[PDB]
Amino acid sequence: HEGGGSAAQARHSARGKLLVRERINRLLDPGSPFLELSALAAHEVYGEEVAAAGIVAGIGRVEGVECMIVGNDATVKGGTYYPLTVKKHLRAQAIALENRLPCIYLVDSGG
């Protein structure tokens, strides 16, 4: 939940940018639950560290609707899409298609 390490993470809030996991909790309904998906995403997989594979995703109530939400961690390697970041984003839209949940994409990535 640290992201790209206190290091960059702070250099983030510096830009006046709310952090990923924050934008989420702000977006959800007061006190709603949140079911995260693959947090241990890309754990000890890539050479370096890529927390939750640079993208957090999960299901939470937004305006009384169970919604699928995904936002990238600009702090993690510039938010860029490592192979597993893609597998994640995708696995999220499967859960969304298969279970008919509207989608909220909190976009903030390099390339």
């Binding site: 924050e22 909790n25 309904d29 006190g31 639950p33 949140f34 079911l35 109530r61």
Partner: peptide, 19 residues
Amino acid sequence: PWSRNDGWRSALARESDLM
């Protein structure tokens, strides 16, 4: 169960951020 506003989370503790 999505009505329970107990701030449930997967493994850490109940997280509720209020403005």
